[PDB]
Structures are given as structure tokens and as C-alpha cells.
């Protein structure tokens, strides 16, 4: 992976994620929403396995976005967990958790779950 | 399990669940919300393993509630998945998924996830 991960990825709803994978396991970049805009850009940070297994297994990885930038504060954070699979049609398959900040009476319904696939195309 | 499951269970938020576990794996009963009321009662149905392992392993089980009765329709359904552990302080430990009916534009945020523990006390 490593060099295979570095680049631009797109998901099925129109979001774009740009990432550098550093030599000792660091992921750093930006996430931007549909429309695409100077103001839908948010910082991302995560970690990946820098020595994956040599059989046809995927590379495990994860990252976080807090939904606050200079134009907007949505009082929430999303984590994606998944694996990179390389080759002709490389993709990242993930499941995600989105938690909102709540009062204690509302805490039982604070978290949504879903899934995304990212491609280079 | 079986006879060990049959009865009244309570969770940490004040909800009450009454269940019969039938000889060949069926679970049937009612769920009622906090307050406790003739009008917060909903039908439940599920399945459990009727021949569990003889070591100290739990009994795996699951059930569903659709949130519609004669007084109220909330256009949603919850599934609980977990295991029964018996003995002096028996409990059922679960994780759950709540899906609302949505338009396709809203489908990415249709499902919440959380967790409950039920006791006989």
C-alpha cells in the first residue's frame, strides 16, 4: 500500500478525500463535501499498517474528521474503519460511525452507522 | 437457557420486556416503554439457540420490534442482537440497530446504533 494509498479518492455520493500516507503509518489530508468548495474543506488524520501481509490480504486503516472549519461548526465527528485493496481496480471499503455532541437525556440516540466505497475514478 | 430466559427483564432506561422462549427456538412477547402504559406496548418476535454449548459460553439470541400499535406509528423498526448469561446475576447483553423509513436522499442517515443490558431486578 503506502504509495498505493496516496492520492485522490471519490465515493458514491460525490465527496472527495485527498491523502498522504507517510512512511511510518501516518495518514494526513483534507475531506470535501459534494458541491466542492473552499468552505466544505475539513482536516483529516489517521493511521495505516505500513508492513501488510504478503498474501492477497488487504491493508487495514482508519481516519477521523471533526466537522468544524472557519465557516461552519456542526458539533460532531466521523470515524471511518476499513481496508485498502490494490490492483487494476483499487478501492477502499469502509464502515463509519458519526457521533453528535448531546445532552445526557439524548445520549442514547447520539450515533449513526453506515458504509462507503472509495475509488480512484 | 430456555426456562432461564422466560420472564420479565428491565434495562437501564426504565423499559420492560416480557418473553416466552419456546422449545424449538422461538421467542414471543411484548415490549413497553418508560412510563409503563397500555399504549406503550408493542409486539416482539425473535429466535434463540435451543441447544447451547455445555462449557461456560452464553446463549446467542436476537429479536425485532416494529414501532406501530393501535395508538401510535413511528415508521421505524429496532433489532437487538446479543447473548444470555445465567447464574446468580443473570443478564442479557446486547447491541441494537434502529432504522427509520426515509426518502432516498436521506437514506445515508437512516440508522442509529447503541447498546443495552437487561437484568431480572
Amino acid at each position: 500500500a503506502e504509495a498505493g494509498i496516496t492520492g485522490t479518492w471519490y465515493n458514491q455520493l460525490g465527496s472527495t478525500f485527498i491523502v498522504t500516507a507517510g512512511a511510518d503509518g501516518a495518514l494526513t489530508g483534507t475531506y470535501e463535501s459534494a458541491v466542492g468548495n473552499a468552505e466544505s474543506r475539513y482536516v483529516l488524520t489517521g493511521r495505516y499498517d505500513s508492513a501488510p501481509a504478503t498474501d492477497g490480504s488487504g491493508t487495514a486503516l482508519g481516519w477521523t474528521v471533526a466537522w468544524k472549519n472557519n465557516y461552519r461548526n456542526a458539533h460532531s465527528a466521523t470515524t471511518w474503519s476499513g481496508q485498502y485493496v490494490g490492483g487494476a481496480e483499487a478501492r477502499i471499503n469502509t464502515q463509519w460511525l458519526l457521533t453528535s455532541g448531546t445532552t445526557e437525556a439524548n445520549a442514547w440516540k447520539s450515533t449513526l452507522v453506515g458504509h462507503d466505497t472509495f475509488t480512484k475514478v | 437457557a430456555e426456562a432461564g430466559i422466560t420472564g420479565t427483564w428491565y434495562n437501564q432506561l426504565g423499559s420492560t420486556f416480557i418473553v416466552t422462549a419456546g422449545a424449538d427456538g422461538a421467542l414471543t412477547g411484548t415490549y413497553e416503554s418508560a412510563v409503563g402504559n397500555a399504549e406503550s406496548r408493542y409486539v416482539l418476535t425473535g429466535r434463540y439457540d435451543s441447544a447451547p454449548a455445555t462449557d461456560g459460553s452464553g446463549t446467542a439470541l436476537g429479536w425485532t420490534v416494529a414501532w406501530k400499535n393501535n395508538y401510535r406509528n413511528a415508521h421505524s423498526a429496532t433489532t437487538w442482537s446479543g447473548q444470555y448469561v445465567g447464574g446468580a446475576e443473570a443478564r442479557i447483553n446486547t447491541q441494537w440497530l434502529l432504522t427509520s423509513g426515509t426518502t432516498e436522499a436521506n437514506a445515508w442517515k437512516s440508522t442509529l446504533v447503541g447498546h443495552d443490558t437487561f437484568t431480572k431486578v
Binding site: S15, S33, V35, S40, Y42, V65, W67, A74, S76, L98 | -
Partner: peptide, 8 residues
């Protein structure tokens, strides 16, 4: 309209 969703 949460920023994770489409659009905005």
C-alpha cells in the same frame, strides 16, 4: 444539512 451529506 450535515456537511458529510450531499450537498454543502
Amino acid at each position: 444539512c450535515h456537511p458529510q451529506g450531499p450537498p454543502c
